[PDB]
Design a binder for these strands. Sequence first.
DNA 1: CGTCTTCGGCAAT
DNA 2: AAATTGCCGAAGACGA
Length: 344
Amino acid sequence: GASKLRAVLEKLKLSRDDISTAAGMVNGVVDHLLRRLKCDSAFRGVGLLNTGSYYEHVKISAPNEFDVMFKLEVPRIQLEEYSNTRAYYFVKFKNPLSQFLEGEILSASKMLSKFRKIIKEEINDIDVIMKGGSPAVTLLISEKISVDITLALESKSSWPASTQEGLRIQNWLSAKVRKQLRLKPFYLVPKHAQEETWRLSFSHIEKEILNNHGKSKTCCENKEEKCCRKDCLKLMKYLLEQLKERFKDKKHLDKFSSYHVKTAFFHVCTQNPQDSQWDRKDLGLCFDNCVTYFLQCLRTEKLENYFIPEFNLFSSNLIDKRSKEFLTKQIEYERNNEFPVFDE
DNA sequence: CGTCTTCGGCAAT
DNA sequence: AAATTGCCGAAGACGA
Ligand SMILES: Nc1ncnc2c1ncn2[C@@H]1O[C@H](COP(=O)(O)OP(=O)(O)OP(=O)(O)O)[C@@H](O)[C@H]1O
Ligand SMILES: [Mg+2]
Ligand SMILES: [Mg+2]
Ligand SMILES: [Zn+2]
């Protein structure tokens, strides 16, 4: 019901007064931590990269969770793939970060220790409190707003071989745009699989795609070309959020995150490259495409990382089969009854 | 649809 | 020498 879905999206609209107060609190704390980190020899070339739903304009309910990425431009990087995970690597150099070296590989553990320590020493100074390595630190500002701070290495090199067949946007955002996007740097965040591994990150490309998302260059720039891509992502994020809360006493949905929904959404955009396939009048049909695709990923236990096709976010090593069947069962029930979790 | 606010980039310090 | 910063304009809440 497109009429009901529009009512849900109004409920999910952020308060501009809340945005102004929340952004002010986040920026003040983030700018403070950047100034301190820029004073350290190791974090000398640190820079800010705003990531996540808020800066992608797909945050729902309230601006209570922010995601920032503190990126270091590292030089002469040499990646070594860990096992055959296609997404986790060991970092080597072909310098400031010499202190974090353990042998010849860059220690994500050591680098995370100084990162957390410098931030923790600076957070006790401030009405903010600090709480698998990525995000490095989670701040709670005034008991209302949480900010995930992710340490990240910036490599301006060509993307690793595992991403060769990823970012399949040629028939959607154009091969010209895929060439320019893959020219931008890629990022490595400390994530353990072994605690000295780094995981590939493309949150900057995800933000850029979401804010320049149409086949048409003028998509969502005027009233005539308002698509419902972001509305469908919001509805999918809310559906998973309401289900995880409804079944929080059970532990099945604890492994599911909004990134699974966001990754699945990018795949639906590849499957439906035209803006006419995302017309505002067809919000219920477009949302059902996102639901139908997400059910297919659950049932087949296959949800490829949008940038690393061989990395399966729904792998059996990552999520239990009973968790996928449970979420499959609940989504099918929810769809067959006009999504009761939206009313709550 | 005009107004106001925030965010992102990068010449110019 | 290279990190900082002010500013322009899009995105989107908001109302009338
Ligand atoms: N498993 C993952 N693999 C790769 N990148 C991830 C993963 N989880 C999160 N990210 C990156 O971190 C960012 C923030 O993720 P987070 O878990 O905070 O949710 P989100 O995308 O911000 O949406 P919301 O916070 O509203 O649920 C994402 O935009 C994504 O780019
Ligand atoms: Mg977020
Ligand atoms: Mg997070
Ligand atoms: Zn659009």
